[PDB]
Every structure is written in C-alpha cells, then in structure tokens.
Amino acid sequence: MASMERFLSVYDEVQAFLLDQLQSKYEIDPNRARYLRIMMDTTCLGGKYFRGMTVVNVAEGFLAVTQHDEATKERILHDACVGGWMIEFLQAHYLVEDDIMDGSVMRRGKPCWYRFPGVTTQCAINDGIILKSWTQIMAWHYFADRPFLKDLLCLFQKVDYATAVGQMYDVTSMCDSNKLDPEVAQPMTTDFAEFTPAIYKRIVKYKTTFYTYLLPLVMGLLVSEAAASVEMNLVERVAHLIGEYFQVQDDVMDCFTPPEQLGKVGTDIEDAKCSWLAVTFLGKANAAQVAEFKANYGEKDPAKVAVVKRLYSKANLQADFAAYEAEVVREVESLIEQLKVKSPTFAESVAVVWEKTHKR
C-alpha cells in the first residue's frame, strides 16, 4: 500500500467510527450526523496532509529496519495513520477557531468554515471544539491497550497547550507588553521595540513549531516504540529550527505570493503582525525608513499597505532571506548529523522532513 492511500483510507474508517458512535451512544439524528460529516470533511481535508504523513513516514522508516510480524507492521502503520489524523484534526481545530478570531475570509481558496451560510460563528466555535474532542476520542478508542497511550496523550496535551500559548503570543504581538490589560482596549505599539528576532522566534516556536514538526516526529517515534533510539533534546532543537523556517516562508508569502496562488488575501501588514519581514526590515532600515514604516503599518488603507510593501521591496529582504536560509541549512544539517549517532533511520526521516520544507 502507498502511504497516502493508506492514510486516506484510515480517514474513512475514523470518520465512520466517530459518526457511528454518535448514533449509537450520543443519540444523534441523521441530519446532525450529516452536518458533522460535512464539517469534518470541509475542515480536515484538502490540504497536503504534511503533518499527519510525517507520522506515517517516521514509522515506515523504522519498519524498514526492525523485525516484526506482518500483522505488527500493519498495526504500527494503522496507529501512525490514526496518530497523523489526530494531528490533522488538531490543526483543523486551530484553523477553524483562528479564522473566526482573525475575521479571515478564505482558506485554501474556499470560504472559512464559519462563513458558510448554514454554519455561522455560533456553530463554528463549537464545531472547532468538537474537532479537538475527536482527537481524544480517536486516541482512547484506537490506542486503549497500547503501551504508548499515556506518553502520546501527555505529549499531545503539552503541544496543544503550547500552541494556544503561541496563539496568545501571536495575537498580542503588536501591543506593548507593559500595556496589556483586560480592562483597557489595546493600542497598537508605536515604537515597535518588541519587533525583535528573539520575540519573533518565541511567537513562531509556540504557535507553529510544536504542532507542525515536534508532534509529528515524536508521535512517529511513540507509535514505533522507538523514543529510546533518539536524543529527545536534538529532536526538539531540529523541530524548532525547521518550524521557524517554515513560518518565515509563510510570512514572506503572506506579503508577496499572489492571492489566487496563496489561497488567501494575506493581511499581515494590516493586522500589524510581528512577521519575519517586519522584524528583518526593522533590523536594517535607516531612521527615515523606520519613520515611514511606523506611519503606514497596521492600517487597513491600501495606500499605506502598498507603502509598506514598497519599503520591503526596496530594503532587499531577499539578501537577508538567503542569509537566514544558508544558516538554517548549516544548522539543520549539523542536527541531522548529531541524530545519526543514535539513529540513522530517524536522521533520514528528519532529512526528508527538511527537504520537503526547504523545497515547497
């Protein structure tokens, strides 16, 4: 079986399990089951499945070098697929709720879930809640007797929480920290003193890297019973590095990739986001450029947004990006090498994760 066709088949199985259980234990009626099926499909399907497929690919790497009965190989790959779906559904949760939080319009060239006519925010917030509850239902059903159940649940937990903390860091990244206060409407920063590489790295590390790279790698290890084949501090370091790179690419595309190809009209400039572009621009601009940036950033007005893009284009951020990129290559290669000391196999999976991130 090709990995993807297996992965997609298990989607059907897991769907059927979840919807069957709603009928037999939760008193659901057919029409509400249908609503939930369409929600699941609309929110969980149609991406590249990169995160979920990482789990599968790590497990396949270990299968190639570890003796097992065929039934065991099948069970490991089935667990890797279920695990990969937990992560895809956790992402689906975050996208549903992030789109509502941000007032986003499109996602993957389609309307955000909450904007569907028969959804609305009222339902969509709860639909996103369900999306995350399904990850736990899947885990308890499919991994009930597995030795890795507690490790897997505890890891998932910690990554989920890191992610929500990262969301807080992201949505508050344009306020001055010393002014955060539930009682007082939050002004945009005027000094941009918190637009630094280190602050940017904290946002991205929590908001993206834990669920996008750490979780799939470690889940692949856990379903393979292979966590003792690796030095976990290196897995953390390499996940944090590659994830930061993925995010930097995303931040560049938000500004410069045509909307039809992006799947989205990017609004980071209007949202005053602490993006890689803003931080890198502020790390090289002269006084005059800084003052032009401050008078134009974080404003809906297209004239001001175009002034911000013009500033980015004249600031030659391609050079800063190539430099960042070369450094990331050095470091990711270094970490891949260190990972070979204990697991050539796993190092190779990480190389593959890196190639697919670096090329996309």
Binding site for its own copies (CB under 8 A): 22, 26-29, 31-32, 34-36, 38-39, 42, 97, 100-103, 116-119, 121-123, 125-127, 129-130, 133-134, 136-137, 140, 149-150, 153-154, 157, 160-162, 164-165, 167-169, 171-172, 177-178, 180-186, 202, 205-206
Q: Does 325 bind Mg ion (CB under 5 A)?
A: no
Residue (6 or 107) nearer to Mg ion, CB: 107
Task: For 331-349, give the DSSP string.
Answer: HHHHHHHHHHTT-HHHHHH
From the CB of 99, what's the least distance to Mg ion, in Å? 8
- Among 96, 80, 170, which Cα is nearest to 133's? 96
Residue (85 or 210) nearer to Mg ion, CB: 210
From the CB of 117, what's the least distance to Mg ion, in Å? 20
Residue (122 or 233) nearer to its own copies, CB: 122
**Binding residue numbers:** 98, 102, 170, 236, 250, 254, 268
- Among 333, 352, 357, 358, which Cα is nearest to 59's? 352
Buried-state track 296-330, b at ≥16 Cβ within 10 A, e below 16 = bbbbeeeeebebbeebbeebebeebbeebeeebee
**Measured between alpha carbons, how far is 270 from 106 in angstroms, rounded to an integer?**
16
- Among 264, 246, 234, 252, which Cα is nearest to 205's? 246
> Which of Mg ion, its own copies, none binds 250 (CB below 5-8 Å, type-dependent)?
Mg ion
From the CB of 117, what's the least distance to its own copies, in Å? 4
> Which of Mg ion, its own copies, none binds 130 (CB below 5-8 Å, type-dependent)?
its own copies
**Binding residue numbers for Zn(2+):** 98, 102, 170, 236, 250, 254, 268
The set of residues, in sequence order, having a beta carbon less than 8 Å from that of 326 and lying 6+ positions away, is none
Q: Are 353 and 51 in contact (CB under 8 A)?
A: no
Q: Does 108 bind Mg ion (CB under 5 A)?
A: no
From the CB of 70, what's the least distance to its own copies, in Å? 30
From the CB of 122, what's the least distance to its own copies, in Å? 5
Q: Are 173 and 274 in contact (CB under 8 A)?
A: yes
From the CB of 218, what's the least distance to its own copies, in Å? 16
Task: For 96-153, give the DSSP string.
Answer: HHHHHHHT--EETTEE-GGGSTTTHHHHHHHHHHHHHHHHHHHHHHHSTT-TTHHHHH
> Which of its own copies, Mg ion, none binds 9 (CB below 5-8 Å, type-dependent)?
none
**Measured between alpha carbons, how far is 44 from 176 in angstroms, rounded to an integer?**
35
By CB under 5 A, the residues from 75 to 104 that bind Mg ion are: 98, 102
Q: Are 205 and 166 in contact (CB under 8 A)?
A: yes
> Which of Mg ion, its own copies, none binds 254 (CB below 5-8 Å, type-dependent)?
Mg ion
Indicate which single residue of 60, 244, 254, 271 sits in contact with Mg ion (rule: CB under 5 A). 254
Residue (182 or 302) nearer to its own copies, CB: 182
> Which of Mg ion, its own copies, none binds 133 (CB below 5-8 Å, type-dependent)?
its own copies
Residue (62 or 113) nearer to Mg ion, CB: 113
The set of residues, in sequence order, having a beta carbon less than 8 Å from that of 102 and lying 6+ positions away, is 267, 271
| N- to C-terminal Cα separation, the chain | 25
**Binding residue numbers for Mn(2+):** 98, 102, 170, 250, 254
**Binding residue numbers for Mg(2+):** 98, 102, 170, 250, 254
**Measured between alpha carbons, how far is 106 from 102 in angstroms, rounded to an integer?**
11
Indicate which single residue of 250, 270, 292, 331 sits in contact with Mg ion (rule: CB under 5 A). 250
Q: Are 33 and 23 in contact (CB under 8 A)?
A: yes
Quote the tokens at residue 329.
Answer: 């290559």
Residue (165 or 227) nearer to its own copies, CB: 165
Query: Which positions lie near Mg ion, rule CB under 5 A?
Result: 98, 102, 250, 254
